[PDB]
Symmetry: D2
Subunit: 280 residues, 4 copies
């Protein structure tokens, strides 16, 4: 059924599936080996594919993710699309491999020992990735620690574009009902007003920072998602994590302004975060 | 709520609403006069706006239509977006005025007297408009006679982009359930397979030709939409209209091939239709 | 395609279509004559049917309306389902005929002369109809003046159940995104919280009262739907119509309490409205 | 946010969470102990709850499942709803515990040794459960081996009602787009025609039988979900599993008739399956 794309197509015989990296929401990812880089030698990659119980939504999400990674482009703070097996056979999305795993699990481990200087660097990389994304006119809609992978040598890479959208010409004003996004990372306009913008992503980024500075802590601790709907309206916000500069918490609190225009842009988070690193 | 766009914004005091051109599915259009073209004099235009009972879908559709007309661009066989009043007040979408009305009502009238040479010219213009649209990577999804307007001097213009989509980077494979498109103009893959492509639009164009050559006739005469679901699967198609070249009916029948890839592209319909006109 | 229902099926030869009563959102209604009541003589009825450009949504809405009117039952303040032509041919929904037309247009006319005593009676009937509906565990979701018909002798009848739902066992908590309901009649939880209950309908009823006491006035005069989203959050409400008891406006204002549980039930509106009538 | 239900409410202090039984699609289930049966002693139960990354869909699904289990009722071949913690705190759905696990994993294990007589008994129980469900006017929409649990003493229990629907008064004709159902278990009308009936469930049951008689085999072996769309149209079906009576395969093949009305009802599968067991 799927159409063809010559520039991205990759021969099935040059791929050898292996150890399953983990099951997802609309499929699963397994470790693999692919012959084709321009050296033409075996480099380790990750292959996202469907399961037996796949639904049409699962199918459409994975295809969407493949199509998003193509328009986004090449960047070091995001996982790059290497190749894909679409023609005659099961869909395979070939992306780069991240040896350390996901940011959440990574952080919760080292609590060798990790430093504060690292956390600011870690956050800065992510700010850079999101700045680029926003420049490409793409809204992620699912920014979280679990969705950030870390390779060998510790490079921060934003992953999982199954829910991302192309905002180049269309913004989906009053069309995005956002019922499939995790509530604890959603901005108020996303939850109640049927809209999603770059400013909505900065809110989520704010929550991402909290996860980092708590070493993989779960947002709104002790507060179930079901009561968060009214609390968010009341103006409730999370408090400062013991192990965070008073300048950092103000950045978080800034991403959490009820009014979208009053929140900082990703370019701003880049400049300000760059400053703090130099003075660390 | 709506963001701003300087290049397209138009002052409310320079607009004078008037005679209602007709009610639609998600609002209504009225005749107006606007001072701002670069002469700076009063030119007649059409203003699309919401009604009192507007829904959020109605709202989102109209905004979508405005955003689509911006990425599509300037073309003579499509109604151009002139201006828009978004800032502080009711949304107003200012597009050009078509004096004769819609193709369907237009055709059903003259049955002075109209010629066959006209019908081929009429169809050719439409083929040109759709070729351009496809080039801009836009799928209309609602091509029909009622959605084609004709100005003074008889220029064919494709209108109503509330259902159109941007296919530049994303195609919506297995996501488009297409429940809001008129069934008698829908291609089989659109109705059953959760997809919509340029080839799907050629099918609809095929039905548009039938409407033209029957002088505003209603597709599948005597067949209710409710039984069309099974008939379309059986391979049922419409027959040749008495007042149509045997070469024309083959073009229609070609747009109606169950397999999308076996249908002609819009560029082909351009070349072939151009040929027939010269020999008319 | 549609299944069969013996108890409601009505022979096509005993029906004679006629004057079109008006076009709708998902079809149209025309005046007709049907032989079959138990006298077996020609009684005037209204037939709801699809148009040529019908969509699958239009189709599904009309079928839904037919199925809703069956579970709701027999009541004088609601338009009753008389019969239906589903088997072999175009779907026809046969409901009773209302000679005066819709409440909105009706009211805007007489502004012979109508009295205040009438308006309270008119509102009381509607309160009775909605009480019954709520008892049948049905949420209308589209209560408005335009959706209330008035027969000969002036009986108030609630119509148009295409958007109504069955709440008997399922309530659709966080599933109802409500994007197809007119915003000026929607309750805040309906617009922002992805829920709809009987309390949501009382809000709409509150707006219905305003329409009545303004003689077919348009809600939130001078305020476009697009700015109503923020105003509703601010706590903005409509003010008292000159030609309304100070006791009435308090009932309206009571249907408009931000908290659903603080609004009056339909049974309460019945008792209180019954009181005022006796003292009029 | 969630309303209250006295007859089903269960005190949080009388529940002790424990070992996680496994993660799901919209939450997770953990083993627990609850004091309240009418003995008033500690009985093991299973608690379905949300995770930190829960979405509004996840939330709405779990609530839907709780509401479905209430209207369905008490039956031995389905997992019964014991209690629920909704008021003030995280939503907890308390259902009965199944010690052996899910049918799929169960079967794939014993391939002590299991007999053919068992498989017919196993299939018969499931036929009984589904007959009852259909009687209650509920469509499961997700019948599969993975969704059938087996308790101690080997009783077959149908689980996971997050996707189930109430068909009592409404059937959702042309409304059910079914994009969240696993394709390998879907009936053709479900996949292409926007409908779902009891006959659609018999198809899935047909696939369930295949899973049983292959000892937890994966449907359409070697055929990826992506090519199944065209194959299903071509009339392709699965072949007889080596370890299945020629009378059984005919029952499967009967559930797989393209025309819904030509498939057997659940009552029929009950009578016929009951016959074969007696002669085993
Ligand atoms: C979102 C989701 C779930 N679909 C998902 C899951 C995995 C990935 C992913 N993971 C890795 N690399 C990697 C390496 C080690 C481990 C750790 C695995 N773990 C360690 C502990 O023991 C059990 C296995 C995990 C991942 N590389 C690329 C990608 Cl694209 C992306 C999305
Ligand atoms: C799709 C829909 C309905 N929303 C819709 C409706 C109208 C238009 C539209 N119509 C005109 N010009 C025009 C001129 C005359 C008549 C004829 C009007 N008619 C003639 C007979 O007497 C009654 C009025 C009709 C239109 N110009 C621009 C536009 Cl954008 C577009 C879409
Ligand atoms: C919601 C919608 C639009 N689909 C719709 C439209 C019409 C009805 C409806 N209308 C009537 N009776 C009636 C009588 C007179 C007039 C007045 C007609 N009007 C008067 C002025 O001149 C032009 C025609 C209008 C209606 N009876 C039963 C029904 Cl079920 C229901 C819904
Ligand atoms: C659909 C889904 C996933 N959400 C899901 C998951 C679990 C259940 C469920 N499971 C059990 N009992 C049980 C006992 C043992 C094992 C085996 C667990 N397994 C064994 C092998 O080692 C690892 C753990 C599994 C389940 N009881 C009641 C319920 Cl309601 C229902 C749905």
């Amino acid at each position: 059924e799927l159409p063809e794309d010559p520039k991205w197509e990759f021969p099935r015989d040059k791929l050898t599936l292996g150890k399953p990296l983990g099951e997802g929401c609309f499929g699963q990812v397994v470790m693999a080996e692919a012959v084709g880089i321009k050296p033409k030698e075996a480099v380790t990659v990750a292959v996202k594919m469907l399961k037996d119980d796949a639904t049409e939504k699962d199918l459409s999400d994975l295809v969407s993710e493949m199509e998003m990674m193509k328009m986004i482009g090449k960047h070091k703070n995001i996982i790059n699309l290497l190749g894909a097996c679409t023609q005659d056979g099961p869909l395979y999305v070939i992306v780069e491999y991240a040896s350390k795993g996901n940011l959440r699990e990574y952080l919760r481990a080292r609590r060798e020992q990790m430093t504060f200087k690292d956390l600011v660097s870690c956050t800065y990389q992510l700010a850079r990735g999101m700045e680029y994304l926003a420049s490409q006119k793409c809204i992620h809609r699912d920014l979280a620690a679990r969705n950030v992978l870390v390779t060998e040598n510790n490079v921060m890479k934003i992953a999982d574009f199954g829910l991302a959208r192309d905002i180049n010409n269309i913004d989906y004003y009053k069309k995005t009902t956002n019922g499939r996004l995790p509530v604890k990372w959603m901005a108020p306009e996303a939850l109640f007003d049927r809209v999603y913008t770059h400013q909505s992503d900065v809110w989520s980024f704010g929550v991402l920072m909290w996860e980092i500075f708590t070493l993989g802590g779960s947002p709104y601790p002790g507060i179930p998602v079901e009561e968060l709907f009214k609390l968010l309206k009341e103006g409730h916000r999370m408090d400062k994590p013991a192990n965070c500069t008073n300048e950092l918490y103000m950045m978080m609190r800034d991403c959490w302004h009820a009014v979208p225009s009053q929140r900082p842009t990703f370019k701003q988070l880049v400049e300000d975060l760059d400053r703090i690193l130099t003075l660390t």
